[PDB]
Assembly symmetry: C2
Homo-oligomer: 306 residues x 2
């Protein structure tokens, strides 16, 4: 009953967030086993921000230049290294609340929970999709740098995102946990613009499948289409290409509802040309693209995370 | 930067959720100190729900007729009583993860976060408003009863909602933690429905303020209106009447942006009368009413030009 942009429970990740200070900069880090991960821009200053020389800044740093705090407990830094745009501080204590975890680099269209933090202290949680243009539509205030995005699959926490930069554009950008940025962005405080964004077609379809499971079925029609003819309409309304791979990923939902994917594609073709005509779908007056096929299944199945 | 619906982190509340079983019904409980709170409908059979005498039904129950499990830890029930529509199971063990907390009866138009649970285990988290018709737009399947809603102020969790039942329109109803329903609803199986879904005018206005602060201003017009003329339009479109209290609450946002509240109302008047004409505001094709003035200020706080 009902359908919401639903985040994962944050409890496992809250237990991993610490405060990291270097100079006058404080931001958040992720404490897993005996390593703390944070944005390397913690080692810049104001003077440096615009165009820092990270290699040089790091060489000149020693362990005592870093202050790491888990609540009030000071964690002693016993080693420092840089992996792409992420700083890794070795500490003397393994985090006893370390959940089983992996690091994954996510693909555009895939979603995750952002745990927004300030000064090592979790503040808020919301869902995001990695956009086609490699931005996210987040909400981040000062000191949110090092906030991470994650998925939970069984017991296992998969970290896919760490927040590095807010550009005066309104643009949010970050890295995987190996420090490689999503998109062409760099950790330099300068105007950087995203390429133009597109709608995530496969997700739109997943969400129409969610509509049907919840008994909102007015948009369904008798028409059908080929993939190629659909993609000729995809590209006109600024939609990502629907691959054959996508069509097959929408199999489980097609079976559970007994509506064929290409039919649902036909129903989508019609909603694009004709608009909604004052109507809504699952309480929205536009086509939602930030729910994946897994997301729909998760929410409609009531999966839990222990 | 940016603007998103955000829930509070769920970790403190996850530590409080347990599983309660009575007869063939399993649902969630809230474990704080040595008391477990749950919907009193857990004591009933399907047949009992048609015409339940709760006092009678409870007398026939003993402590061993309630099975409480916190994860795998069984908790001995040593007392039971009922406060309005909530069951209170005294147990022999105080919850070691009990946070600082209060019980609060929330006002309509105000927001809270929901941790949806099943079998005393967390499934996900999302933010709701207490709507004027005293329903909430949740996401709740079978087994979700006893899920709670809350706000965190510092380290103090203020619990305000416990989930009891679902309406066919995809909305949900429940009690405070003293067991008093929000709205005219009852925990028996009789004919019931949500009143008209009145829109929270003050929140829509706040959200239009967020919109302009996020650079989306197409809907501003030169016009102004009076309280009375606006309220005539509000009555026609099922919006709450604007009050002087609402005008005053929007004071900060008005002052920051330099747009008088009654000027913003005139902008809202046109949107209601003419609709959106295909356009979006903050990436929505309808007027959002689940952000309070407070929620907006927290994400849209800025400078005022002097």
């Amino acid at each position: 009953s009902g359908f919401r942009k639903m985040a994962f429970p944050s409890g496992k990740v809250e237990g991993c967030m610490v405060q990291v200070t270097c100079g006058t900069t404080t931001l958040n880090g992720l404490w897993l086993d005996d390593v703390v991960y944070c944005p390397r821009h913690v080692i810049c200053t104001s003077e440096d921000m615009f165009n820092p020389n990270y290699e040089d800044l790091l060489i000149r740093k020693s362990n005592h230049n870093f202050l790491v705090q888990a609540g009030n407990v000071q964690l002693r830094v016993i080693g420092h290294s840089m992996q792409n745009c992420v700083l890794k501080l070795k500490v003397d204590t393994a985090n006893p609340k370390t959940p089983k975890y992996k690091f994954v680099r996510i693909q555009p269209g895939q979603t995750f929970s952002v745990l927004a933090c300030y000064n090592g202290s979790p503040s808020g949680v919301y869902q995001c999709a990695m956009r086609p243009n490699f931005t996210i539509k987040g909400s981040f205030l000062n000191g949110s740098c090092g906030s991470v995005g994650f998925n939970i699959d069984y017991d296992c926490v998969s970290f896919c995102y760490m927040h590095h930069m807010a550009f005066p554009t309104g643009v949010h950008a970050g890295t995987d946990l190996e420090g490689n940025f999503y998109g062409p962005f760099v950790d330099r405080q300068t105007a950087q613009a995203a390429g133009t964004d597109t709608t995530i077609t496969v997700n739109v379809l997943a969400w129409l499948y969610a509509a049907v499971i919840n008994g909102d079925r007015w948009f369904l029609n008798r028409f059908t289409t080929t993939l190629n003819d659909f993609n000729l309409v995809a590209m006109k309304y600024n939609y990502e290409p629907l691959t054959q791979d996508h069509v097959d990923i929408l199999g489980p939902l097609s079976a559970q509802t007994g509506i064929a994917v290409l039919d649902m594609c036909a129903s989508l073709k019609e909603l694009l040309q004709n608009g909604m005509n004052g109507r809504t779908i699952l309480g929205s007056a536009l086509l939602e693209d930030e729910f994946t096929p897994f997301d729909v299944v998760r929410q409609c199945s009531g999966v839990t995370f222990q």
